[PDB]
Amino acid sequence: LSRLDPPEAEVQIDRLITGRLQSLQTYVTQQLIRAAEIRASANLAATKM
């Protein structure tokens, strides 16, 4: 931001934004799958109780 001019800075910023978006999406999907597994475990635990 402090090195480049405005019109050429967006070209660089787009790569970072796409990479971080992909990383966040992967993390969210992994968390969803793990949450489903924990949901199954919790249901089994409640039935056992």
Binding site: L1, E10, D14, I17, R20, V28, M49
Partner: protein, 124 residues
């Protein structure tokens, strides 16, 4: 949150992210649903009794010694010897410094201990 992890609190990065659609709402909705599901799981697992029961001071359980698992009175909390042993058996700021917060559980440990003690008292 997205705008802080993805963008370092700058107008240019936020205005560039604004044109990618409603991804942030989807991610936030998914995470909030996950947290609510965790709270529901805890409540469904433990909140199985209508009323909190109280074990009698008399320990004449036919010779069955129950001192290990019953709640410990001479302790700051009500956790038993086994419970405290398990608790003892089983950097944070850095993640929060980039917009990754860790919410506190709805039911604190003392409430779970009370629920467990009530369940044991009712069973015995």
């Amino acid at each position: 949150d997205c705008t802080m992890y993805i963008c370092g609190d700058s107008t240019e990065c936020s205005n560039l992210l604004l044109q990618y659609g409603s991804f942030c709402t989807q991610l936030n909705r998914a995470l909030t649903g996950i947290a609510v599901e965790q709270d529901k799981n805890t409540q469904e697992v433990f909140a199985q009794v209508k009323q909190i029961y109280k074990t009698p001071p008399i320990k004449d359980f036919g010779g069955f010694n129950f001192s290990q698992i019953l709640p410990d009175p001479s302790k700051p909390s009500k956790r038993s010897f086994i419970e405290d042993l398990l608790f003892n058996k089983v950097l944070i700021c850095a993640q929060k410094f980039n917009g990754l917060t860790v919410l506190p559980p709805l039911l604190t440990d003392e409430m779970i201990a009370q629920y467990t003690s009530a369940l044991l008292a009712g069973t015995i």
